[PDB]
Amino acid sequence: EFRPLTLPPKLSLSDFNEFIQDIIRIVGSENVEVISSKIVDGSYMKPTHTHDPHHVMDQDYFLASAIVAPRNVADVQSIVGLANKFSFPLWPISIGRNSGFGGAAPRVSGSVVLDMGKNMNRVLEVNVEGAYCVVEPGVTYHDLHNYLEANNLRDKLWLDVPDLGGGSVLGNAVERGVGYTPYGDHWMMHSGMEVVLANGELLRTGMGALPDPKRPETMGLKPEDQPWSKIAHLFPYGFGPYIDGLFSQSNMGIVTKIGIWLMPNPRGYQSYLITLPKDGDLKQAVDIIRPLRLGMALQNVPTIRHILLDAAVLGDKRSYSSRTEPLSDEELDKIAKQLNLGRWNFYGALYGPEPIRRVLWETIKDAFSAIPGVKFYFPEDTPENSVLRVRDKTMQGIPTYDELKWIDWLPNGAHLFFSPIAKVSGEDAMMQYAVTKKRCQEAGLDFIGTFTVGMREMHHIVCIVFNKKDLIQKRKVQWLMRTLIDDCAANGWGEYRTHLAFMDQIMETYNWNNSSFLRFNEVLKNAVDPNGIIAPGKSGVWPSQYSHVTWKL
Amino acid sequence: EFRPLTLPPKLSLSDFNEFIQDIIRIVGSENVEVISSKIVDGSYMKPTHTHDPHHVMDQDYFLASAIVAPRNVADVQSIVGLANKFSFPLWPISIGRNSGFGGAAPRVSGSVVLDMGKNMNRVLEVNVEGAYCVVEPGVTYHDLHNYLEANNLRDKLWLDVPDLGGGSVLGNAVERGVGYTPYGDHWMMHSGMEVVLANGELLRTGMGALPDPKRPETMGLKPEDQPWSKIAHLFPYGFGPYIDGLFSQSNMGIVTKIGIWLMPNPRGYQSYLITLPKDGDLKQAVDIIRPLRLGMALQNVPTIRHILLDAAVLGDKRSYSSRTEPLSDEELDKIAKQLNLGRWNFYGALYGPEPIRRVLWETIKDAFSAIPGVKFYFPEDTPENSVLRVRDKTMQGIPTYDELKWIDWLPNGAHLFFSPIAKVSGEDAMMQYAVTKKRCQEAGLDFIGTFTVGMREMHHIVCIVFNKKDLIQKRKVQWLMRTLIDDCAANGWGEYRTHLAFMDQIMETYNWNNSSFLRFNEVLKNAVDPNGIIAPGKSGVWPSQYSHVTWKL
Amino acid sequence: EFRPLTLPPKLSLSDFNEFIQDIIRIVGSENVEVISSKIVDGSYMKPTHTHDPHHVMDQDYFLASAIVAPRNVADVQSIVGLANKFSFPLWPISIGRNSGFGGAAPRVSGSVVLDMGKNMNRVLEVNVEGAYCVVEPGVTYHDLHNYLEANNLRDKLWLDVPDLGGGSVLGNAVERGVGYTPYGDHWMMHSGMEVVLANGELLRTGMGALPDPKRPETMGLKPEDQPWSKIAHLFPYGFGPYIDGLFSQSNMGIVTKIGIWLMPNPRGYQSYLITLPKDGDLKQAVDIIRPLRLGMALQNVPTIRHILLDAAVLGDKRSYSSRTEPLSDEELDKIAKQLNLGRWNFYGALYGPEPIRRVLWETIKDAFSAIPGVKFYFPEDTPENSVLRVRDKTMQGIPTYDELKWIDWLPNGAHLFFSPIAKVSGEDAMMQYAVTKKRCQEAGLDFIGTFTVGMREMHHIVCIVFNKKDLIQKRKVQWLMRTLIDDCAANGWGEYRTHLAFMDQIMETYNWNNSSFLRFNEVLKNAVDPNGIIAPGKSGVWPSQYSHVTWKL
Ligand SMILES: *Cc1cc2c(cc1C)nc1c(=O)[nH]c(=O)nc-1n2C[C@H](O)[C@H](O)[C@H](O)COP(=O)(O)OP(=O)(O)OC[C@H]1O[C@@H](n2cnc3c(N)ncnc32)[C@H](O)[C@@H]1O
Ligand SMILES: *Cc1cc2c(cc1C)nc1c(=O)[nH]c(=O)nc-1n2C[C@H](O)[C@H](O)[C@H](O)COP(=O)(O)OP(=O)(O)OC[C@H]1O[C@@H](n2cnc3c(N)ncnc32)[C@H](O)[C@@H]1O
Ligand SMILES: *Cc1cc2c(cc1C)nc1c(=O)[nH]c(=O)nc-1n2C[C@H](O)[C@H](O)[C@H](O)COP(=O)(O)OP(=O)(O)OC[C@H]1O[C@@H](n2cnc3c(N)ncnc32)[C@H](O)[C@@H]1O
């Protein structure tokens, strides 16, 4: 194809054409869409691979020149080798459902979006004795689930899913996303991964670097196709430098396979809901959660959900008030009463044999009872369309899609995640929450959020919903985010993850000792990708060809 | 003036004298010893910092030209730029008690050993709600146990210790070393770490990149002295590339501070011994352990110890036998009848409330019953002198040095570790034990070794004890080590950790795809340390100034 | 031509086309086949110049982009100059019958296969007083023979041929192949050669560097066309460095002419066969051969042939057993009796006047008689289709093609040579033979082999035959070879020659002092071929543009 919508940096239209024609020759026209005109948002079921479907910028700000779907790893080696020849940036996606953080879109306009999971979608292995799987990019959570369910494996191994099943297992891991069983730190639960580097070369990290001994049936296989050794996915460190983190939220390589640990079926399980009546209950509740989480009475990643999250699953805004402006604290309580919920709602789960669940539940019951008005529930005890029935599945690794609903709080709706980290402390959870709220009212948005409760640590996921056709809200949303980053960085809170538009501003928060951390990351980046091929601008890590003057926001 | 026994590569006696003069001035000659006469092996109590105290190669083969001890970070910075000026290799050490792996000797003879711990020994912070501490290299496990006792803090926070409590908490963590509570994975339990790079700039990882908000009290501090932000030592990842691992088992920088997570007091503890009468009971032992550990009954890192390991603690070889050759199986299980131990002996522990510890004990106890003639004891049930009583201190974070006794198994005692990783597979462990044993007896040694029980992996620690005034036995020791690597690599096991002399050969077992892993690191190494200053050859990672034909072993 | 089947490294399809069109302009379309689709194996009579006809890899693994047939040396200078312009690797063949070692195929897929002998096939000189010839690449053995036979020269000069006449005289020399008269070391018997270097330049080695003095009839000639001096082909060293070996089994240049010594007609000759009954007779026989070879009672390169070699010439496998699996030792003896042969069969020849042949034959008779059951034969004494009648020709330099037959032991048959060197020692010949056999039974192949008996030295030519359409045998064959290289390198035996697929693994056997020899060869290679044009990957000698990570096997 001939005349794309945007060109990447430096590139002559003839150079594009020589390049995109050399690739039609490798993947076939089957596997190459050049983007030549109007770049539609689509849906969660048909994820757009061209731009950010939940656009806070102009719809076309983050935009591709072309989508390329390699068949196999060898093409990936070729496509990278070819981008070096032509100085052509690439943006690896596995699935492209990174909505809230920019969807499938590249940082540098005109990049090839490299669809790794169209073709490479194979669940390569499920091992029961070692309690692990191995996956290519295209393997979603529903996929991996469906595979398990087909093979009578639900009784022996369980998944850990995020809120929505459509995500990449692999993509989410490298992003360091959060799920909700014991194995919720998707990244911690990885061992042994494969990567194609900017220079073309295939690499296996950890014990993947220990080769599988030669034997009759493995001969003649191409690196990508070769087996792994005994310990590859059992123990991630191997010998020497632990390099695996260089490919999480970074642009040092292209991940082709990953090993993930799966919790074994516990032989017993109990979801539950603790409802917390007053808005100020947050403070004491956190303080009660702290030791329970630290001593493993909270075994999984329970969440503390602001009432508007649960309410937005059950309806859009306009089904509660025909009001323009953020609902009042007085209204927020009326909604809570209508649904049999607190202003905050603690969702969580118990795991193991029942004498053990007994004990820990007796502990949790007792501990939360210090709050006035506290009410406990099991799935049994709730109506059929409740959030607890959804999270009963989620907290035993079962893919749902019901949480999407909260994207249509507002017409033409789109989310953006502001995700500062907080202490498991009342004072700290309350202050940060109070800072976040003020600013959403200042921008005229309803606060919607949730706390994913890590071990010593909470990811506070602020769920900024906005009418994506309302351009005055967009600019207010942008103002909200840029301000919230500074507000929170001014109180010692950083962000674990962002949208394309905020990657630079947030990497400027991590500037202890005159941008030390960024400068070291650049040294590595420029060393392993001399040409600046791989996702330039990812996590604010620009290679040496991109003036930081022009490209940062 | 100063005339040292060896000099680093290519470096004039005058250069050396000028270099040290500068340092002696910067640091004061209390903190400089030059190595100018015939290099004492030393004790654990006061460890040598010149050469390998447990020497498998010649005593003078790994030998430092001098030893420097920085007063503070600044001195490290100053020393680094001075090493850069001169192409002078530095070898960082924390405490130096890394014996069985070389201790504090360098790879390259002529290197300066950089004793970090001598001066930089302050428990910078303990933190009760965050359940963490922050330490300099000089904070030993005992220093830190000491600290918590002084402040009556063991009611609220426990430790996790190696078999001996004189290691560096920092230095052990960066070697991915191992303890035996449920925080036994020492590297995995860090968060936030300070590092001086080869260019001498400071760098803090994770949320250590987020600076603590500028206030009037902390103003005008140096970077080394600056407080960390709220989330520093709570959430390890921060934002963007997760570089923490590049400073583990590596030569990418000098670590000055590290956060470690502390397991809080369970509120209930009880160690236990299970004896396994027969040698063959290992397969079924492992096969039963596999699922008990995956499902988290076995909460800590338990240990399966060969009879001789335990016996070597209670007494030396001579105490049990005048035999020159290795002790035979008839004699070995005689020692089991003497001591009321098995051929193998399982040590593990139970944590948390009485009702829970009951339920897990029941199952552990009734699952292990499938091995014929098995037995069960608590600390109380055994002798006052027994090993369980000792390990009862170890698996609650109380340091001992009682485990040092098995080194004196032979006269002129010196340990050395061969540490392959096994599947949690009865068949696998046995086939590994059988290879390890086979080469021990050809080498003329008593097999001694404990398995550690990780989640999906076991570190099989082969405990090579030898007489070091016996030189015939050192050549056979060397032969043994170099062979067991290649043997185990030929079966698909790799080593997590080694002695100096085996780093080049072991990095060569990780040669999947024509030494791709090693090639990637070398690229990282040369980017971040242009002058090859820091610890060349550490993990066989040679910077471009050291030729692979001259320096590989 | 426009769209080739595979492209070489880096190369845009437009670049290929500019390049292959500039060459159609030099050699004509007469002399350029671009390979645009399905790459057939062909036969010995019609040797394929596209790929390896005896493929152990996938048929298309080693594959060309194009075949170019230079007319004359000047084109060769042009084609090299043009490959430097475009960075286009070239793979020089003379004839392309290097079957067993990869046929005509290149190492790097997409190279031009440079057909040197299509056009340049002229026997340039035959000198009788100096007893030598001079040949271009296309001069085969049958050719050179036919030329001699046309010119009434059989009475004065004799050839030395390998098993098959179709080979290049020149190509085999530079490979260092083996023939079977006194002049069997084809490489030793060279003096004065011509080469085109990677930089374009024509060079004459040895005394070829001494120019032929100016005289009337030699004026205006282009370097290639010029005469040689008096001593050129009479004495190979010349003055200064003996550089000739840089163009044997290497990629330092393109050989355009070579001088070869021809044995003069001895004036008397007697082929013979000594049959050795038991399989274990090998041991003693070798020991008897040793002094006879060392004192020139064995004047030529006699061979010790395993009975299955002789039997495979006389029939395929299926004419002896309809059995899948390797014939038993019990069956191997039944075949031997049926054909009037030993388990081993010693073929050899006597040369000179009959009183001299008498003496040496009386010596050989006597010496071999120490073996029980030994039987001597002349050609007279054997049936017409016997191997001795074939080797009666071979050992007086007469081209045959009868040996091909053994390629059809198995259906769809193809050979591969495993060619370790051995001592003229029984213990050593027997061990190596015993190692080789075990492994062939492990792979389920019949051992077929022969020992070419050099002076102090045997080339043990293992004749691995395999059904080339049976993909499970292929992988077994690959396993056999990769294992046999290590087995034999583990006992001090290296290989004198290999297939494309094994060149890297075998150059890794020659790694004394941390790959010293390879590293020096690279220094030279990168010096004389800066662009990496000439046969990159030949003998595992990769230039600096090819990551050793990607290209080695
Ligand atoms: C809208 C929404 C989103 C959401 C959620 C609830 C709602 C209503 N709940 C989430 C949760 O509980 N936990 C969580 O981690 N995320 C949640 N989200 C966000 C989103 O649904 C998921 O995170 C989703 O898994 C992310 O998208 P996807 O799985 O499709 O991953 P991707 O878009 O393909 O990749 C994102 C980025 O990762 C890097 N990447 C990906 N693949 C590679 C390869 N192969 N090599 C190198 N880098 C890779 C790129 O930077 C890419 O852009
Ligand atoms: C003899 C012995 C050893 C032993 C053991 C039992 C016996 C009888 N049991 C162990 C166990 O159960 N678990 C374990 O992990 N190790 C065990 N060992 C070995 C040893 O005693 C301990 O591991 C000890 O804690 C390690 O020694 P130390 O803590 O003193 O570390 P070091 O001497 O400084 O050397 C470690 C290496 O790491 C690098 N390093 C260290 N500090 C730095 C800094 N600041 N910067 C950069 N690199 C650093 C160096 O390469 C150094 O050599
Ligand atoms: C199947 C078979 C093969 C065989 C044999 C018996 C059987 C049944 N017996 C042999 C024997 O007794 N002795 C021996 O040396 N080889 C034997 N073989 C193998 C094969 O038939 C011959 O070796 C044959 O002579 C080799 O093929 P050819 O003569 O065609 O040479 P080539 O394929 O063209 O060249 C091979 C490689 O040499 C380098 N080369 C060649 N020409 C050049 C020039 N002009 N410049 C630079 N390098 C050159 C290349 O590496 C080329 O690939």
Curated annotation (Swiss-Prot), chains A, B, C:
Its cofactor is FAD. It comes from Penicillium simplicissimum. Homooctamer (tetramer of tightly interacting dimers). It is found in: Peroxisome; Cytoplasm. Binds 1 FAD covalently per subunit. It holds the Pfam family FAD-oxidase_C. The gene is VAOA. The modification Tele-8alpha-FAD histidine is found at residue 415. One of its GO terms (cellular component) is peroxisome. PROSITE patterns: FAD_PCMH (PS51387). Induction: By 4-methoxybenzyl alcohols, anisyl and veratryl alcohols. Repressed by carbon catabolite. GO terms for molecular function: D-lactate dehydrogenase (cytochrome) activity; D-lactate dehydrogenase activity; FAD binding; vanillyl-alcohol oxidase activity. Residues 60-265 form the FAD-binding PCMH-type domain. It catalyses: 4-hydroxy-3-methoxy-benzenemethanol + O2 = vanillin + H2O2. This is Vanillyl-alcohol oxidase. The active site is at residues 101, 496-497. Optimum temperature is 38 degrees Celsius. One of its GO terms (biological process) is methanol metabolic process. Its EC number is 1.1.3.38. Competitively inhibited by cinnamyl and coniferyl alcohols and by isoeugenol. The record marks 163 as: Important for the catalytic mechanism. To bacterial flavocytochrome p-cresol methyl hydroxylase. Its main location: other. Optimum pH is about 10. InterPro entries: Cytok_DH_C_sf (IPR016170), FAD-bd_oxidored_4_C (IPR004113), FAD-bd_PCMH (IPR016166), FAD-bd_PCMH-like_sf (IPR036318), FAD-bd_PCMH_sub1 (IPR016167), FAD-bd_PCMH_sub2 (IPR016169), FAD-linked_Oxase-like_C (IPR016164), Oxid_FAD_bind_N (IPR006094). PANTHER family: ARYL-ALCOHOL OXIDASE VANILLYL-ALCOHOL OXIDASE (AFU_ORTHOLOGUE AFUA_3G09500)-RELATED, D-LACTATE DEHYDROGENASE. Catalyzes the conversion of vanillin alcohol to vanillin, and also the conversion of a wide range of phenolic compounds bearing side chains of variable size at the para position of the aromatic ring. Crucial for the degradation of the secondary metabolites derived from the degradation of the lignin. Catalyzes besides the oxidation of 4-hydroxybenzyl alcohols, the oxidative deamination of 4-hydroxybenzylamines, the oxidative demethylation of 4-(methoxy-methyl)phenols and the oxidative hydration of 4-allylphenols. Most active with 4-allylphenols. Keywords: Cytoplasm, FAD, Flavoprotein, Methanol utilization, Oxidoreductase, Peroxisome.
